[PDB]
């Protein structure tokens, strides 16, 4: 049997209305021995509020057992270590994993918006670009909106490591050319821990 | 027992007839006791004999890594021929076979667009020249920057991202001194892709 431990979703850690969680995933749990016991530590201190998700039976005659611990936003942001100890008969010894926020001094994303190329104006849909650079760490959420409402049709690159040790990405929003020509304002909104108040939004229009 | 990994050629190598595309069959965890590895290669099922075994590499778990490199023909790879590596070794219960080939689906020509620095960026010492490459398939591509005939090397390129229409896009970012931009220095982003005319296109960016 084998153990993986996953951090919270970056957006979950920055929203007042979301509750972030750390997840401990146990694979290769034998049919003969299903009882997995989890112990959870916040900075080496046991906590008790985890909940075991219902087993999933993998099709190589083994179970997957998952344990989810809700965490406090500031706890995660403050860089506390979460430890998952996994006990089970089919293991000779308990397996222990630990996770925390990426280490390194935070760096503020610069956010710039770039209008479509003139050459793209040959097409029926055009690309609005948002460049997000100089950020650390890579936990970030990017969205587009207009007139108060989310835009459906955008895609964001993964963070890419720049040569100064910070990250950058681009977000591309696609819109009907006529919406761009009519003067509509589009906005790129970025959430990141090292932004002031963890949020910024940048707008563009013709 | 050993395990086997088969790697395709580099995008650039398949696109330029001056370069040498290769498929690479990598055998890991070859034991000390049974170190001899045999490869047979097949192109669409026809055995070929030109593969070359690299010198044995030593792994730090008391094991060897053995690598075979097959030179392939450019049009073969791009025509979607299947490359099969059969790996035989005494610690294997049966030989191991792996196959690779170009992703399937009608190629699509990338659109290449250069976008200047944001006005808001112009307060900094260095500015970002951006190249948007979109609408391409398959994801095999190479992207470079030039200025005044010589390579500009201070760039990074995102991996391809799957777009919501089933094609790919990426962006490449070249970092240059603000001063070089403001003087009207001409930069160009070159893209290499199978679906381009002569596998190559270049687009200018300049104040």
Q: Which of B36, B71, B100 is the last residue of a domain?
A: B100
Question: What secondary structure does DSSP assign to A78-98, as a single string?
Answer: TT--EEEEEE-TTSSS-EEEE
Alpha carbons B34 and B64: distance in angstroms, whole number: 10
**Residue B198, C-beta contacts closer than 8 angstroms, at least 6 positions apart:** none
Question: What secondary structure does DSSP assign to A91-154, as a single string?
Answer: SSS-EEEEE-PPPS--BPPEEEEEPPPGGGGGSSEEEEEEEEEEEBSS--EEEEEETTEE-S-E
Residue B60 lies in a domain: yes
CB contacts of B134 in chain A (<8 Å) are: 127, 172
This PDB structure is determined at a resolution in Å of 2.0
Alpha carbons B161 and A157: distance in angstroms, whole number: 6
> What distance lies between CA A188 and its chain's CA centroid?
17
Number of domains in chain A: 2
Residue B105 lies in a domain: no
Write the DSSP symbol of residue A7.
-
Name the residue among A112, A158, A174 with its Cβ closest to that of B120.
Answer: A112
Alpha carbons B14 and B21: distance in angstroms, whole number: 5
Distance linking the first and last C-alpha atoms of chain B = 60
Q: Are A109 and A135 in contact, with CB atoms under 8 Å apart?
A: yes
Is residue A18 located within the same domain as residue A75?
Answer: yes
Task: For chain A, positions 102-131, list CB contacts with chain B under 8 A.
Answer: 110, 112-117, 119-120, 123, 127, 129, 131
Is residue A115 located within the same domain as residue A187?
Answer: yes
Distance linking the first and last C-alpha atoms of chain A = 57
Interchain contact B134–A (C-beta under 8 A): yes
Is residue B160 located within the same domain as residue B184?
Answer: yes
What is the least distance, in Å, from the CA of A113 to any CA of chain B? 7
CB contacts of A131 in chain B (<8 Å) are: 118, 128, 130, 171, 173
Structure-solving method: X-ray
Alpha carbons A2 and A86: distance in angstroms, whole number: 9
CB contact under 8 A, A163 and B154: yes
Residue A86 lies in a domain: yes
Interchain contact B202–A (C-beta under 8 A): no
Q: What is the token pair recorded at A10?
A: 């970056």
Residue A105 lies in a domain: no
Query: Comparing C-alpha atoms, which of B149, B158, B156 is closest to residue B187?
Result: B149
Is residue B81 located within the same domain as residue B118?
Answer: no
Residue A7 lies in a domain: yes
B74 is in an annotated binding site: yes
Alpha carbons B1 and B28: distance in angstroms, whole number: 9
Is residue B95 located within the same domain as residue B151?
Answer: no
Structural domain that includes position A141: 110-204
Q: Are B129 and B118 in contact, with CB atoms under 8 Å apart?
A: no
Is residue A14 located within the same domain as residue A87?
Answer: yes
Alpha carbons B110 and A119: distance in angstroms, whole number: 13
CB contact under 8 A, B115 and A110: no
Dihedral sign of CA atoms B12, B15, B20, B26 in order = positive
Is residue B17 located within the same domain as residue B55?
Answer: yes
Backbone phi and psi for residue B120, each to the nearest 5 degrees, phi listed first: -65, -20
CB contact under 8 A, A115 and B113: no
Is residue A134 located within the same domain as residue A197?
Answer: yes
């Amino acid at each position: 049997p084998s153990v993986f431990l996953f951090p919270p979703k970056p957006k979950d850690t920055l929203m007042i209305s979301r509750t972030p969680e750390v997840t401990c995933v146990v694979v290769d749990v034998s049919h003969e021995d299903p009882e997995v016991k989890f112990n959870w530590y916040v900075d080496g201190v046991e906590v008790h509020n985890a909940k075991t998700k219902p087993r999933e039976e993998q099709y190589n005659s083994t179970y997957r057992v998952v344990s989810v611990l809700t965490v406090l936003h500031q706890d995660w942001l403050n860089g506390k270590e979460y430890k998952c100890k996994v006990s089970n008969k089919a293991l000779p010894a308990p397996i222990e994993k630990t996770i925390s926020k990426a280490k390194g001094q935070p760096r503020e994303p610069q956010v710039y918006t770039l209008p479509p190329s003139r050459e793209e104006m040959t097409k029926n849909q055009v690309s609005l670009t948002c460049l997000v650079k100089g950020f650390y760490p890579s936990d970030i959420a990017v969205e587009w909106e207009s007139n108060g409402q989310p835009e459906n049709n955008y895609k964001t690159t993964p963070p890419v490591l720049d040569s100064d040790g910070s990250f950058f990405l681009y977000s591309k929003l696609t819109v009907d050319k006529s919406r761009w020509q009519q003067g509509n304002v589009f906005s790129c909104s970025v959430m990141h821990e090292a932004l002031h108040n963890h949020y910024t939004q940048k707008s563009l229009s013709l």
